[PDB]
C-alpha cells in the first residue's frame, strides 16, 4: 500500500482481533493483552459504506428501446442496430472494469492510511517516553501498568507524569 504500514512495516495482521479492524497489543508488568481501537475502525468502515451507498440499490429505469436479437437477415439497418448495442456494452464494460479497479486501489490505500494515522497519533502522544521499534511497536521506557496502557488507548496519558523515569531509562549507559 502507498502508506507502507499494512503489508509494510506492520509484518502481518491479527486473526485474533475480531472486535475491530485496528488496535493495540501490549506487554507490561501485569501480562499481555489486546484491545480494538473503535475510532480508526469506524473511520475506515464509514468510508467503505460511503462507496457502497453510491453503487448498491441505485439502478436506472429504461423502457422501450431497440431490438437486440433478430430472426431474419436484413443488412444495413440491422448492422447499425447491432453496432449501436455492441458499442454501448463495450463502453459500459470498460466503465465497470475501471470503476472497480480505482475503487479497490482506493479502499486499500485508505485502510493503509487509517493504520498509519493511528500509529502516528500514538507516537506523538508518547513524546520522549518511548521509541519506535520499526515494526509498529513502541518500547515504553517506564513502568506502564494496565491503567497506564488504558490511558494511552483512551487519549488521557500524561507524558509529563513519566518523563523523568523514561529519560533516565533511555539515556543511561
Amino acid at each position: 500500500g502507498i502508506f507502507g504500514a499494512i503489508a509494510g512495516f506492520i509484518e502481518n495482521g491479527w486473526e485474533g482481533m475480531v472486535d475491530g479492524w485496528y488496535g493495540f497489543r501490549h506487554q507490561n508488568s501485569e501480562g499481555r493483552g489486546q484491545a480494538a481501537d473503535l475510532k480508526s475502525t469506524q473511520a475506515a468502515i464509514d468510508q467503505i459504506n460511503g462507496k457502497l451507498n453510491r453503487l448498491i440499490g441505485k439502478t436506472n429505469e429504461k423502457f422501450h428501446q431497440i431490438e437486440k436479437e433478430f430472426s431474419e437477415v436484413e443488412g444495413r439497418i440491422q448492422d447499425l442496430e447491432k453496432y449501436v448495442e455492441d458499442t454501448k456494452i463495450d463502453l459500459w464494460s470498460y466503465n465497470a472494469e475501471l470503476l472497480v479497479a480505482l475503487e479497490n486501489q482506493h479502499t486499500i490505500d485508505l485502510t493503509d492510511s487509517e493504520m498509519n494515522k493511528l500509529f502516528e497519533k500514538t507516537k506523538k502522544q508518547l513524546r520522549e517516553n518511548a521509541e519506535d521499534m520499526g515494526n509498529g511497536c513502541f518500547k515504553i521506557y517506564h513502568k506502564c501498568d494496565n491503567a497506564c496502557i488504558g490511558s494511552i488507548r483512551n487519549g488521557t496519558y500524561d507524558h509529563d507524569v513519566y518523563r523523568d523515569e523514561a529519560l533516565n531509562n533511555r539515556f543511561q549507559i
Binding site: 488496535g23 506487554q27 457502497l52 423502457f63 422501450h64 465497470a96 472497480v100 479497490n104 521499534m133
Partner: protein, 317 residues
Amino acid sequence: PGATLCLGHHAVPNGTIVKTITNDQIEVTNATELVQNSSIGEICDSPHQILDGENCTLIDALLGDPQCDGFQNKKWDLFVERSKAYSNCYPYDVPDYASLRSLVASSGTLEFNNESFNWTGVTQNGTSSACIRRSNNSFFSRLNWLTQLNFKYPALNVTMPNNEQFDKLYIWGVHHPVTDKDQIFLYAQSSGRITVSTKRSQQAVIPNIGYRPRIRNIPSRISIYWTIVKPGDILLINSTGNLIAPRGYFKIRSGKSSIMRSDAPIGKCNSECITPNGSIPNDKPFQNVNRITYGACPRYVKQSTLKLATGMRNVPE
C-alpha cells in the same frame, strides 16, 4: 523493565481476491459482488402490468385473429410475445412490420373505438375458411372485407373526421387475389386501387395479382397498412376495389410501455427488473444476464463477476 505497545490491524483466514490498478490479484478481508449473474426464471407479474401474449403476437391481437379475442381493449406496461405464437387467420404481411409492432408496443393499449363508415353499394363482412371463429368462417375482428354487390363495386369515397382531442390509429389493408378471375369474382372490375389520405399524408396501393404458396388453403394474401389522424384532420378513403377496410380506430398513447420476446413463465411475485430469462434482483449496479431489459435494471456488462473490496489488504499470520 517497562512495556511494549504494538499497533496492528485485523486479518481473516478466508480472504477474497480482487483487482486494483496494478495487480489483477490481491487479497482483501472481504468483498461484494457487483455483477448480477442469475435470474429466478420467471417474469414477476408485479409491479409492472404484464400481458402474456400466449399464442398471439401483438400484431395478431391488434388485427383480431380469433384466438386473440380475449385481448380486446387491454393495456400493458410489458407485452410478452411467446416463441410458440402462430397466426390462424387469413394469410397476411405488413410492410414495415417491425415499425407497426414497435409503435403499438410503445403505445401500450389495444383500446379500439368502432366508427360507422358509409359503405354503400358493396357487400360487407367477408369471411374465409382460413379464419375460423366459433366453428364458422370468419375474419379479423377489426377489419371489414368489402366485396361486390349485385355484380357491381361502385367507387368508394368516404370521410371520417377526427374531432377528438387525441390521435387516432387506423389499420387497413389490400387484398392481393391469386388470379385475374378471382379479382373479377370479388371486386367486379379487373384492377383495384386504394388511396388513403389526410391533410398531411397520402398512401396509394395497387394490388398485385398472383399465386403465393398456400397457407390454410389460401394462395392469395392481404397486405396491412396504417395511418395516424391528428385532431382536426380527416381520413379519406377513395377506392375502386380490393380494400380491406378499418372498422374504427385504435387509441394511441404515449408512455413507458414495451414488448419483449420471452418463454419464461409469469409468476405471482414482485420484481422491478425484467429480462427474457426472468426477473432479476436490482441491488447490484451491473448484470450479465441479458442485454434486453425492462424496468429499473442493473446495466449489462460482459464480465461475469466484478468484486468490490469492502475491507483492507488481508495479511494472515
